[model samples]
Target: LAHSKMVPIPAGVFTMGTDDPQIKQDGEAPARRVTIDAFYMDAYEVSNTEFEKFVNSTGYLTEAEKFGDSFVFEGMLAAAPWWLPVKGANWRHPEGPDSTILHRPDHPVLHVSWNDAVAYCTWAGKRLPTEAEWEYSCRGGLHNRLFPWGNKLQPKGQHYANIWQGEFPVTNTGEDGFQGTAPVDAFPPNGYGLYNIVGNAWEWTSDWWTVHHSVEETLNPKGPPSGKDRVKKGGSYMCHRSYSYRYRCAARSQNTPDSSASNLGFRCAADRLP
Candidate 1:
């Protein structure tokens, strides 16, 4: 099956945001209880091999592929600028035309826009998880914690997720044994058996970006009815505490639905049918 190994997240109520004064502009404050229905989520981020299968079956041209270019982190190219719109930079060619996923089939597929993610999910008979569902699943039954594992970034002196280790935009020590995206199942699974939910790559949610969440308690919030940018949860390998400290379960960023980048990807979710 195309959507195998999906983990079932139990229905429950959990705090959906952070009260901490970090990334305030991202609206990670005024934490509120949110109820989510039971759903099945992909145990691992969508991998290159999976995306390749989808493309082969549907002959789908991704937004990046259609545009003939996509954003690429300079660190991956060891170039001057921090980010570049490289020609021929799509999911198949993450860095540029020269890059290929032949040897990195397990790595999460990048350079996928929200539209592309939605398309894939539709083809897979799934859909992108809502913002609330994404946080709840990423939390993995934990309460008010930072990382999926625990509050500590490195619990018990261990690197649990793939993230930037050194100065951002300048250098990456590859301390986590990877300078870029790691395998989708690189680290241990969260309590809910979800792997790399908060790192490895930023996963797109179905919700649109909003600077303020409604104070009223809600169930399965889909964010504002519509907005310009769609929400992207879980930071990527480029995230660092010194710069983009958005690698937490609650942390979020956004990009246009049509925008594509080298560090963004997504997983699929489905309702628990009777």
Candidate 2:
């Protein structure tokens, strides 16, 4: 389903983590410099339509499909369901099939776990972005900025990314021009021409489970050899500056490779293989 147009991140240097106290996490701490080689990356996160094409062709079932249950927003879930896992909530049914992509056909598909993300990458002839590449793309070549646009999460009159503005879970102000997840291109593109790298959905990368910035290698360092959880990049619509300031470029998070949730999704990348 995905017709990937890969963009290359030239082999170069960039600061991986940050020393910002407000957004810094020990997990992202010991901020340091890292270098990465040129590689092809997807301009946008995988969309539901693209992922659906993969499923339709391969008959592949995601963790949500396999488990027959996954987490959705408490509001999206019924009062009776009440944050309880819902059955049959996969890519096809992000909100249980009752929901549709509708006008937001460009929004990134959520509820994707690392396992499902990797599956999509494999089929598309691409791979997940390295944490460094993810950071670079989000920062959009502007180091030390709070967001791709600038230091201000909310500029004087603009809301570039989707984040809970009202009460969150109860009501969204749509201050960012979106209620829930915006279209993948809902907001303006970043410096590198990537979209929704800030607030849309936390993307799963290829890095294996590791604590944090400890993978401080000089070259394409891919986390520890192996671990329990995999790395996740870019906070989701559910994330806000008030609680989890994971919206920052240097921010990072992780989850078990098999777990899926409403706020999780992924993009793809490919190495310039010889």
Candidate 3:
């Protein structure tokens, strides 16, 4: 009962990567068939309300707070400073000292570094999902699909998940009903009862960065033993069709463990309990 926010993930085998022509720039080629064991995952990305309890108990200082600055999306920054390093930006102050999570208690926590994510999981007796586990869960029993829902991003010409529905960077039409982060349960759940598996905030995986995917192990395959940056899965609210291809299920990006940003956040996973 520790992670009431978690759901059981059934064990199964599925294709792990892809070479789809649509997302060719992603380099998710040589699609491999990978199998994974059953595990549990958080139903939603860690919300600010939940993270607040962790901070209150431990009095922990996030990397952004320690550094006294963190990167913010240029469009989100005041006066449009691109990926500007805003001072006093941290988990509590997403945009800067002036910004607050006043009305976003259920929204996913932002400006959290990989190190910070690991710390939270450790505190909660959970762990970050491996790249394989993360993908398997995100796929939600679908194979070779562009999105967790289906091939079409917006089915029946209606919004499915919280993604940019308008122009990128310069303007957001908020056609999806939100200009920024939405509540963790903003959209319908995937097959596994997972929410915002693709859009909302990019979730971190335990694996290190690697371009070449492995067909070596089907059961719980992890990333390289060492690397400069860790893998990040899923996409964020800023994911635009014309701007970035990372919105796809197979898409991935990497960042140093100490890196933090506005659209980046994470969820937790755990092995089957005894």
- On TM-score, the candidate that comes out on top is 1
lDDT of 2 by residue, 1-274 (tens): 2334556666777777766546544366666778877787787778877877788899887888778888777766532343557777766677775765665566788778888888888887777887877887777777677788888776787777877787645676777776677766567777777778887888888887565456355777777777887889888787765667788787788888988887788888888631
Q: Summarize candidate 3's per-residue lDDT along 71-153 as a digit string, tens digits.
A: 88877763235588889988888899999998888889999999999999878889999988998888888988888888888
lDDT of each: 0.89, 0.75, 0.84
Sorted on lDDT, highest at the top, how do the candidates line up?
Answer: 1, 3, 2
Candidates ranked, most accurate by TM-score first: 1, 3, 2
The runs of at least 3 residues in candidate 1 whose Cα sits more than 4 Å from the true structure, single-residue gaps closed, are: 1-4, 78-81
- Judging by lDDT, tell me the better candidate of 1 and 2: 1
lDDT of 1 by residue, 8-49 (tens): 899999998888848998999879999998899999899999
TM-score of each: 0.96, 0.90, 0.94
Q: RMSD, model 2, all Cα superposed?
A: 3.0
After TM-score superposition, what is the CA distance of residue 46 in candidate 1 from its true location, in Å?
0.4
Clashes of 3: 0
